[PDB]
Design an enzyme around this catalytic site. Structure first.
Site, PDB file in Angstrom:
ATOM      1  N   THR A 118      22.230 -39.026 -29.846  1.00  0.00           N
ATOM      2  CA  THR A 118      23.418 -38.127 -30.143  1.00  0.00           C
ATOM      3  C   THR A 118      24.641 -38.209 -29.192  1.00  0.00           C
ATOM      4  OG1 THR A 118      22.232 -36.424 -31.393  1.00  0.00           O
ATOM      5  CG2 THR A 118      24.183 -35.687 -30.237  1.00  0.00           C
ATOM      6  N   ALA A 166      15.228 -45.036 -30.690  1.00  0.00           N
ATOM      7  CA  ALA A 166      15.132 -45.183 -29.245  1.00  0.00           C
ATOM      8  C   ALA A 166      14.389 -46.457 -28.873  1.00  0.00           C
ATOM      9  CB  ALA A 166      14.440 -43.968 -28.650  1.00  0.00           C
TER      10      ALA A 166
END
Lengths: 236, 48, 200, 238, 127, 228, 239, 232, 246, 196
Positions: free
Chosen positions: F51, F89
């Protein structure tokens, strides 16, 4: 314990087949490469020119990319093979990393190809040695040389071929920082080195220069004769 | 490769062992083509 | 997308091959106006209706094979042999075909006897002795060709008849910007005419 | 020319490019009504019977649906036209090689094996449904090979659009060991019952066929059988 | 979902100009049901024959067939030129059959062939 | 044995365990925990995500900044090269660890450091090979080479854009705005703008999950530093 | 003299029915340095003599670890020993993976036998020039195996291989009647005295030139080296 | 006779450029049974001498004059097995040509493809040349063809030729008696006479083989037809 | 050190098997190529001149490769057949990919790469064929190349291969005028040279085949001279030699 | 939402392309060059997917440059067009949905100007004017209404501005800045961005 096999050591520790490939190199026309400050020059002797020949077809200085160039001495067909592989590799490296090959990268690739052929006694080494001049992407002039075994080094000036020893002695005695100041002096130094093995000079000399950020330019016989005339004037 | 996989520096002996695994694979040419077919004519000195 | 329409007729010692042209069009998407008729010989032509990309691929591979055949055998190819080469190529796709459907129209270089043919996208040839049609408008093309074709025509009657069949087949009251190119192969010459409907 | 992208030598056979391209393209065109080209089918009534010393093969006609496989073996085809053509041509050339090496005229079981194993290899994707029939030293043999590689050795068989009417006629009027005329009339009658809402006939007879002389290559022939204008341009050549 | 990213070690290097256009995204589900059945057909036929020979006769039978196949395939022509496979066909039994590999998309006229040395040293396992 | 070895198939008949069209075939598939570990080249539906991020070039370097903090939002490729995270990730971390492996091998071979163009191109190639297979990368490679400060946006969809201002994430629209900048900003003034821009994201939020300070960065000529 | 045509390849039978490259590989084993293996009712120990050019080098690594229950001592070419050790380690891993239990020593040695037999029949290969003394422990007790370049393997009560190992084997033949009820300490001492018998009368065993590897009922395979051998060497009476 | 090993390798030129292992394969041809080919004005004749010359041979079994298609036929002199392996290949090549082009292969095209196979076998090493030289007779385009392909893979178009044993005398005989306007019947007579030149005793219809090729196509004469030709 | 393989250098750097391969052509028939201002030609000696040899394909030695190129081989004939087939294939592959006819030197280079591959990998005999190429392309116009078994080519304005190539080359070098050659003077020089180097027999228009390449109305015209024209050239030469004598 | 366009004159080829690389998961300035220089007198204008177009154009560029390096002269615009067509056909079949739309502009000393359209299926068509992307039919109708073979560089630029403004009329949208370049006997020249 002898030659006749590529992958056999002699009791002294010599691989003689690779050394005989280098003998093949030592018969070719002399190629002289001089690395300047902002110009890098290549010169090959046109040994035994035939009058009924298209000289465009028997040239020994080639462009690998827009920044790298190469002259060879040895068996010309092997040289054609190695040159075209190097050209494909220059374009492929540009595709891989977007950046122009450094002269060391393409020297390393050419040497790795020759070294692949020095293995496996069912194959035959390339009987050529190359003088790879060029400019790196940050503008440093380079001059490298590979030999049939897969071994490359970086030089300031060099000669390969027949009469490489006399030309290399001349270059050692005559390559200074005052012979490199201008583009013209570098060109004349290469022509002078080649005039040490070339009889009836000027018409047996194939110069090609590469200035920074510019493409390879072959000097036509008129420009070469003008440079040779300047040399004879400077002889006084 | 060792750093990528294990996130640490390979020890001197482990590097020497990997190079040895490569260097002892001569002869036996028609088994893994691209192999070497003769001993390497070089002696190395890994100091770390 | 409109695949096109290619037609061929026989006359007396003469053949005609015609295809639409699309004079006025500013269409978009897949290419529409392409070249459809390719000279495959001195008196031998192939028309290729269908997807434009596959028309070009088929023409180029056919020219590859034909050039090799003519160099090895040292002779000018015959229309039926071209038919068989086209069928072999089309069928070597077969599981994933080329969306093209050819017509061969030529003159045999021994007796100059007309030959016309039409294959489908996997190469099943149909050799008729009156006319062939190939395209997405084969129904009304066939109707018009049956109504107009007369045996033993001559070059001028052949030209008139094939032009009429093409025009009144692609008609749909929409011949606006619809063209027809017609090659008339004869023993002596080849006459190409590009023509429009008079209504415009 | 030496393409840079080629490492291994190309091979032959079916190509299988255009497969994904055609899938996407056919899904796209069908969502717009564009009508890509289709393959030609030859669904028509084909029928065959075994009479006392031969077989009779029949088909509808304007075409020719009775293929040649051997001087003693013939074939009718329904399904994809190109598939029956190529299938029968390949097996005919294979049987020519076989006979030319053996020096014997072929066997119908050899043709049946070649056809069924080829049609099994291409997993029903070659749309050739055939009515094979011939005559060897063993006698008259009639088979019906299906596109997925399944055969069926039968006394009479019918395929195509009128297959049910013709099969009804055969079950009505077929008898073992008919004469050449009786079997010819029965095959014609079954075909005709299969078409009504000409007829080809191939007759391979045991006493028209010598199985003791050495095989020699036969000779073949071939198949496949107002408004006003405004000429904008003209360009004669030669 | 194929798993198998050797990704433990996805360190492999490729030649970008020679790889052409490779799409491993779609190289896991053949384009046609028949694509691999036809690509590996002589391979699968040899495996079927070696399996029946193994199961009926013993280890020696596939070994001798494979040894003959290896021998004849080795006195051949360098890969940038088409070979006839005359002896290999006599051994395999294809000297008197014509398949669709023989008449379709002829290998003798390839429409595309690589460099001589690159194709020879790819066959030698050197890449 | 010697014959099967001279043959070099290996094919599952010239072996041991063959009892039909295959059988046990030397272990009915059972094998070992690998034959080769690593140090050499050799259904879980809950992968993680990211984010907000900035990055602008400069006169004095390149400046990455991320939505505070915990979790990781900037991958530290090596002393001289940075990269941000977006998407998976594991995807970002794995593929830029592979990139750092490539960068170090390059430096060892060539005795000079890789350029940013070359590094971003290597990454774009590695993730373009698996295009359409679900890789989710949103990295943003920045560094400094012989050509000056470098800034590239490399994507898992094959994108590789060079630019002097990039921004990824939720507050991207507000963070690219507020990016009223100049190529000749002072260093302090540059840190100012990146702070203010991640702030004008979070002027509608506050320290928390993916919240905190600004995890600022700064790629100098001799390698990056962490300003705060 | 009549031997020259038939001894250059391992694929040529001499007209006396002998492969000679196999015998030359056996000589290659004799060119190592002596290593001893012996076993009691509960332990299997491996004792090896190391050469280090007598100064300035860490000695050879002569005892290698294959699994928690198998360890080998090598004599002969080192490259071959490493190839065979990699093979042994991979096979032990495969056994633990698939079957969850330690691979039996006899089965491992049989696999080595096949692996090393293939080069002695094939073209373009040479036999393995290393001989091994494999010490194991499994459900059937301690084990000592000897593998040869000829691809033969032997189940030994005790064995010495390497250079001048005949003296160690003479000692072991003289004293093997008491190996079984020896405890670990005096079993390792017996091995040490045999290895010493492979030495000149002047030289003596030190910590610098002795490597020991024990496997046993309670022990996993452990190698004792350069200072860990001192408990074993301290109690060894003079020659 | 081992010129420094230039004699035993197929892939080594001799210092003079010769390949003296392909000319030793031409000595296998010149030591084979005699063959004759005569291209008349309306057909070709292929006559050979049978090696199966005793009474104990089934003569419906194995033949030296073979058809490739309806219009092409072979004879050889040399090593019979090599002939058989090349004959099956030539038949396959002809059928592939038919399958592709829907037309019978021309004689020259077949000769070219067979010669390319032979050439392949003369260049690798670890393999051996073919010990046969073929005569191919064909009829295309209303025109007879007679070709000869030798072990090296180099083919020649002939009007008349002779192979096998005593072929130099055979060619000399053929030169004095061949004329272009020869008809197929006189060609058969001349071919039988040329065989009779170099023949080991009395010549029967059962120890020679004849095959003709005319408009109707290639055909092997039956022993009765050969008997009739011999009687005249 | 010795000459048994192509993959072995002698201890002065000589590849003896390649030199022996190149020695096979000196047996083969004399092929001659001459470049003019308006065309190119290939004059080839018909070696196979036996009585019973049939009238053959349009030329024994001259082969067409494109619309634009022709070749003329000398050496082993079966290797030459393989090589001309591969030349035609290479040219059609270039045309397929670029939709333009292959330039002449690119075709020569591709074939010579094939020949070099056979001189480099062991267990493969080199090609005992020396070719002679003539062509036209939009880059360099009329071109004439030569190639030898080592895969070693070069472009010439007049060259000869085969039997007595050295005497022919001396005569061409003495008599070829660079720049002032037209196709008629090139044909006269070809007859003169090919006469003085075929001194095993008297020259006649049955032991020579001549093919000329020209450009006429935007198309290349490869034409093999008919037997009744080569006789006229030979008569022109004989009358010239009579006049120049007395 | 991409735009390509080409106009060929008696001695020049004029091409324009928009500078948007939206890829709207990231925020960036427009700056985007959709024209790739294949050689000294050839431009490849590519629109389509993101990442798939740049990779294709760079592959084509490396192969065109390799041809120049090996051969000493350059590929003509027509030979580069056909090489591109074959490679796009090979890439379109290897890579499932692969929409790369091209527009090759070039100049040859012995052929003059040359513009080449090529749809997403790799069907090459030499054209006097062409356009890809949004509203392509409307641009094409305007051009067809107003394009004349002897049009000048200035008039061609003005006609280009007509096309873009009239697309802005029919579609109420942003219409970003368009890179404009021209190819004449002197190489590729940059002209002023059409911006509105």
């Amino acid at each position: 314990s002898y030659d006749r096999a590529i992958t056999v050591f002699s009791p002294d520790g010599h691989l003689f087949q690779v050394e005989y490939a280098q003998e093949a190199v030592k018969k070719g026309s002399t190629a002289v490469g001089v690395r300047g400050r902002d110009i890098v020059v290549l010169g090959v002797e046109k040994k035994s020119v035939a009058k009924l020949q298209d000289e465009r077809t028997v040239r020994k200085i080639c462009a690998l990319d827009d920044n790298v160039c190469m002259a060879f001495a040895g068996l010309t067909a092997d040289a054609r093979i190695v040159i075209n592989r190097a050209r494909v590799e220059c374009q492929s490296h540009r595709l891989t990393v977007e950046d122009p090959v450094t002269v060391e990268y393409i020297t390393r690739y050419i040497a790795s190809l020759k070294q692949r052929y020095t293995q496996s006694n069912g194959r035959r080494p390339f009987g050529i040695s190359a003088l790879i001049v060029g400019f790196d992407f940050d503008g440093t002039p380079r001059l490298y040389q590979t030999d049939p075994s897969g071994t490359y080094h970086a030089w300031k000036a060099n000669a390969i071929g027949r009469g490489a020893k006399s030309v290399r002695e001349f270059l050692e005695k005559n390559y200074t920082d005052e012979a490199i100041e201008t583009d013209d002096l570098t060109i004349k130094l290469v022509i002078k080195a080649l005039l040490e093995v070339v009889q009836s000079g000027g018409k047996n000399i194939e110069l090609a220069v590469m200035r920074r950020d510019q493409s390879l330019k072959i000097l036509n016989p008129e420009e070469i004769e003008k440079y040779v005339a300047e040399i004879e004037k400077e002889k006084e | 490769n060792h750093w990528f996989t294990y996130n640490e520096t390979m020890t001197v002996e482990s590097v020497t062992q990997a190079v040895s695994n490569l260097a002892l694979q001569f002869g036996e040419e028609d088994a893994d083509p691209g192999a070497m077919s003769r001993p390497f004519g070089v002696a190395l000195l890994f100091g770390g | 997308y409109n695949g096109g329409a290619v037609m061929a007729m026989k006359g007396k010692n003469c053949v005609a091959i015609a295809a639409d042209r699309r004079f006025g069009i500013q269409a978009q998407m897949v290419t529409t106006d392409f070249q459809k008729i390719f000279p495959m010989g001195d008196r031998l032509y192939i028309g290729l209706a269908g997807l434009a990309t596959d028309v070009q691929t088929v023409a180029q591979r056919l020219k590859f094979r034909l050039n090799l055949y003519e160099l090895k055998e040292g002779r000018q190819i015959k229309p039926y042999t071209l038919m068989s080469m086209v069928a072999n190529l089309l069928y070597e796709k077969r599981f994933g075909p080329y969306y093209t459907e050819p017509v061969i129209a030529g003159l045999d270089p021994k007796t100059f006897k007309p030959f016309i043919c039409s294959l489908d996208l996997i190469g099943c040839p149909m050799v008729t002795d009156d006319f062939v049609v190939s395209g997405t408008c084969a129904e009304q093309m066939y109707g018009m060709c049956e109504s107009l074709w007369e045996p033993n025509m001559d070059p001028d009657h052949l030209f008139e008849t094939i032009s009429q069949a093409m025009l009144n087949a692609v008609d749909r009251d929409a011949v606006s910007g619809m063209g027809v190119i017609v090659h008339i192969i004869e023993k002596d010459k080849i006459t190409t005419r590009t023509l429009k409907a008079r209504m415009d | 020319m030496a393409a840079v992208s080629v490492y291994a030598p190309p091979v032959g056979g079916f190509s299988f490019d255009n497969c994904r391209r055609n899938a996407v393209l056919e899904a796209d065109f069908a969502k717009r009504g564009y009508k890509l080209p289709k393959v030609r089918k030859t669904g028509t009534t084909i029928a065959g019977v075994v009479y006392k010393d031969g077989i009779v093969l029949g088909a509808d006609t304007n075409c020719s649906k009775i293929h040649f496989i051997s001087p003693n073996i013939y074939c009718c085809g329904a399904g994809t036209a190109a598939d029956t053509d190529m299938t029968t041509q390949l097996i005919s050339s294979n049987l020519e090689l076989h006979s030319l090496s053996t020096g014997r005229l072929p066997r119908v079981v050899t043709a049946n094996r070649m056809l069924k194993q080829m049609l099994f290899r291409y997993q029903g994707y070659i749309g050739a449904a055939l009515v094979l029939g011939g005559v060897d030293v063993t006698g008259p043999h009639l088979y019906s090979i299906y596109p997925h590689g399944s055969t069926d050795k039968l006394p009479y068989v019918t395929m195509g659009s009128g297959s049910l009417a013709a099969m009804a006629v055969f079950e009505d009027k077929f008898r073992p060991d008919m004469e050449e005329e009786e079997a010819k009339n029965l095959v014609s009658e079954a075909i005709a019952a299969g078409i009504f809402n000409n007829i080809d006939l191939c007759v391979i007879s045991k006493n028209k066929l010598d199985f003791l002389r050495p095989y020699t290559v036969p000779n073949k022939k071939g198949t496949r059988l107002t408004t006003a204008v405004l000429t904008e341009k003209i360009t004669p050549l030669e | 979902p194929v798993t198998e990213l050797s990704a433990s070690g996805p360190f492999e290097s490729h030649d970008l100009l020679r790889k052409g256009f490779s799409c491993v995204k779609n190289e896991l589900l053949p384009s046609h049901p028949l694509e691999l059945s036809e690509k590996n057909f002589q391979l699968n036929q040899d495996k079927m024959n070696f399996s029946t020979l193994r199961n009926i006769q013993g280890l020696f039978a596939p070994l001798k067939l494979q040894m003959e196949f290896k021998a004849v395939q080795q006195v051949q022509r360098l890969p940038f030129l088409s070979s006839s496979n005359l002896s290999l066909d006599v051994l395999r039994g294809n000297d008197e059959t014509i398949g669709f590999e023989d008449i379709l998309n002829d290998p003798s006229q390839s429409e595309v062939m690589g460099e001589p040395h690159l194709m020879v040293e790819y066959k030698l396992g050197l890449l | 044995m010697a014959l099967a070895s001279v043959l070099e198939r290996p094919l599952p008949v010239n072996q041991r365990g063959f009892f039909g069209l295959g059988g046990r075939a030397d272990l009915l598939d059972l094998g070992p925990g690998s034959l080769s570990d690593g140090l050499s080249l050799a259904p879980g539906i809950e992968m993680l995500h990211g984010t907000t991020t900035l990055a602008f070039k400069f006169r004095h370097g390149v400046i990455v900044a991320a939505d505070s903090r915990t979790v990781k939002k900037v991958i530290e490729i090596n002393p001289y090269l940075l990269g941000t995270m977006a998407g998976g990730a594991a995807d970002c971390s794995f593929w830029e660890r592979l990139l750092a492996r490539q960068c170090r091998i390059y430096e060892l071979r060539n005795k000079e450091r890789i350029s940013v163009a070359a590094a971003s191109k290597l990454l774009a190639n590695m993730v373009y090979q698996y295009k359409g297979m679900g890789l989710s990368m949103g990295t943003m490679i920045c560094g400094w080479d012989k050509r000056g400060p470098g800034l590239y946006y490399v994507d898992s969809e094959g994108n590789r854009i060079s630019g002097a201002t990039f921004s990824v994430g939720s507050g991207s629209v507000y963070a690219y705005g507020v990016m009223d900048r100049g190529y000749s900003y002072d260093l302090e003034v540059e840190q100012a703008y990146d702070l203010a821009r991640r702030a004008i994201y979070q002027a509608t939020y506050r320290d928390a999950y993916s919240g905190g300070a600004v995890n600022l960065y700064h790629v100098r000529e001799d390698g990056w530093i962490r300003v705060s | 003299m009549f031997r020259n045509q038939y001894d250059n390849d391992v694929t040529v039978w001499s007209p006396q029915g002998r492969i000679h490259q196999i015998e030359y590989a056996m000589e290659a084993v004799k060119q190592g340095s002596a290593t001893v293996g012996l076993k009691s009712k509960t332990h299997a120990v491996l004792v090896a003599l190391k050469r280090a050019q007598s100064e300035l080098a860490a000695h050879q690594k002569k005892i290698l670890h294959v699994d928690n229950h198998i360890g080998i001592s090598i004599a002969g070419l080192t490259a071959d020993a490493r190839l065979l050790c990699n093979f042994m380690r991979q096979e032990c891993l495969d056994s633990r993976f698939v079957f969850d239990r330690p691979l039996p020593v006899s089965r491992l040695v049989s696999l080595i036998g096949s692996k090393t037999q293939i080069p002695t029949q094939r073209y373009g290969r040479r036999p393995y020039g290393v001989g091994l003394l494999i010490a194991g422990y499994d459900d059937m007790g301690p084990h000592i195996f000897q593998t040869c370049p000829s691809a033969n393997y032997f189940d030994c009560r005790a064995m010495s291989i390497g250079a001048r190992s005949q003296s160690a084997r003479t000692y072991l033949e003289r004293h093997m009647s008491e190996f079984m009820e020896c405890n670990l300490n005096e079993l390792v001492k017996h091995g040490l005295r045999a290895l010493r018998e492979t030495l000149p009368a002047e030289q003596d065993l030190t910590t610098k030139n002795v490597s020991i590897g024990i496997v046993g009922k309670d022990l996993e395979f452990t190698i004792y080296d350069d200072d860990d051998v001192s408990p074993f060497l301290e109690g060894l009476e003079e020659r | 006779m081992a010129e420094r090993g230039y004699s035993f390798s197929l892939t080594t030129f001799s210092p003079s450029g010769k390949l003296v292992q392909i000319e030793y394969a031409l000595a296998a041809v010149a030591g084979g049974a005699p063959s004759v080919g005569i291209k008349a004005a309306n057909g070709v004749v292929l006559a050979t001498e049978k090696k199966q010359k005793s009474i104990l041979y089934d003569e419906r079994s194995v033949h030296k004059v073979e058809p490739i298609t309806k219009h092409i036929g072979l004879v050889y002199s040399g090593m019979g097995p090599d002939y058989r392996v090349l004959v099956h290949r030539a038949r396959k090549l002809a059928q592939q040509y038919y399958l592709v082009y829907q037309e019978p292969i021309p004689t020259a095209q077949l000769v070219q493809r067979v010669a390319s196979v032979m050439q392949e076998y003369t260049q690798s090493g670890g393999v051996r040349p073919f010990g046969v030289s073929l005569l191919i007779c064909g009829w295309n385009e209303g025109r007879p063809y007679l070709f000869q392909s030798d072990p090296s893979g180099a083919y020649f178009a002939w009007k008349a030729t002779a192979m096998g044993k005593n072929y130099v005398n055979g060619k000399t005989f053929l030169e004095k008696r061949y004329n272009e306007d020869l008809e197929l019947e006189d060609a058969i007579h001349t071919a039988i006479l040329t065989l009779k030149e170099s023949f080991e005793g009395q010549m029967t219809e059962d120890n020679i083989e004849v095959g003709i090729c005319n408009e109707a196509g290639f055909r092997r004469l039956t022993p009765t037809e050969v008997k009739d030709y011999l009687a005249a | 050190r010795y000459d048994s393989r192509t993959t072995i250098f002698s201890p002065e750097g000589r590849l003896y098997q390649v030199e022996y391969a190149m020695e096979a052509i000196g047996h083969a028939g004399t092929c001659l190529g001459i470049l003019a201002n308006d065309g190119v030609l290939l004059a080839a000696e018909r070696r196979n001149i036996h009585k019973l040899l049939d009238e053959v394909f349009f030329s024994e030695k001259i082969y067409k490769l494109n619309e634009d190129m022709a070749c003329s081989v000398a050496g082993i004939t079966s290797d030459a057949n393989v090589l001309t087939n591969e030349l035609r294939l290479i040219a059609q592959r270039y045309l397929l990919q670029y939709q333009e006819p292959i330039p002449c030197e690119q075709l020569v280079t591709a074939l010579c790469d094939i020949k070099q591959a056979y001189t480099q990998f062991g267990g493969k005999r080199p090609f005992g064929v020396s070719l002679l190429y003539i062509g036209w392309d939009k880059h360099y116009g009329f071109q004439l190349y030569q190639s030898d078994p080592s895969g070693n080519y070069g472009g010439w304005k007049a060259t000869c291969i085969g039997n007595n190539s050295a005497a022919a080359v001396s005569m061409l070098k003495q008599d070829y005028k660079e720049g002032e050659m037209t196709l008629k003077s090139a044909l006269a020089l070809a007859i003169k040279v090919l006469n003085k180097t075929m001194d095993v027999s008297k020259l006649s228009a049955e032991k020579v085949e001549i093919a000329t390449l020209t450009r006429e109305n935007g198309k290349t015209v490869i034409r093999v001279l008919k037997q009744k024209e080569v006789e006229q050239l030979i008569k022109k030469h004989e009358e010239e030699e009579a006049k120049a004598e007395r | 939402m991409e735009y390509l366009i080409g106009i060929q004159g008696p001695d020049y080829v004029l091409v324009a392309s928009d500078r948007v690389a939206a890829s709207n998961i990231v925020q960036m300035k427009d700056d985007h060059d959709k024209m790739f220089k294949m050689s000294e007198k050839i431009l490849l204008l590519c629109v389509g997917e993101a990442g798939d177009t740049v990779q294709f154009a760079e592959y084509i560029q490396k192969n065109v440059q390799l041809y120049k390096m090996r051969n000493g002269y350059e590929l003509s615009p027509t030979a580069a067009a056909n090489f591109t067509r074959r490679n796009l056909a090979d890439c379109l079949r290897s890579r499932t949905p692969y929409h790369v739309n091209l527009l090759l502009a070039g100049y040859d000393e012995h052929e003059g100007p040359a513009l080449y359209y090529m749809d997403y299926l790799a069907a090459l068509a030499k054209a006097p004017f062409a356009a890809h992307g949004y509203g392509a039919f409307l641009t094409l109708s305007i051009l067809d209404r107003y394009y004349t073979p002897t049009i000048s560089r200035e008039r061609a630029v003005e006609l280009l501005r007509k096309c873009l403004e009239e697309l802005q009329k029919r579609f109420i949208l942003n219409l970003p800045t368009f890179s404009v370049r021209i190819i004449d006997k002197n190489g590729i020249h940059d002209l002023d961005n059409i911006s509105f």
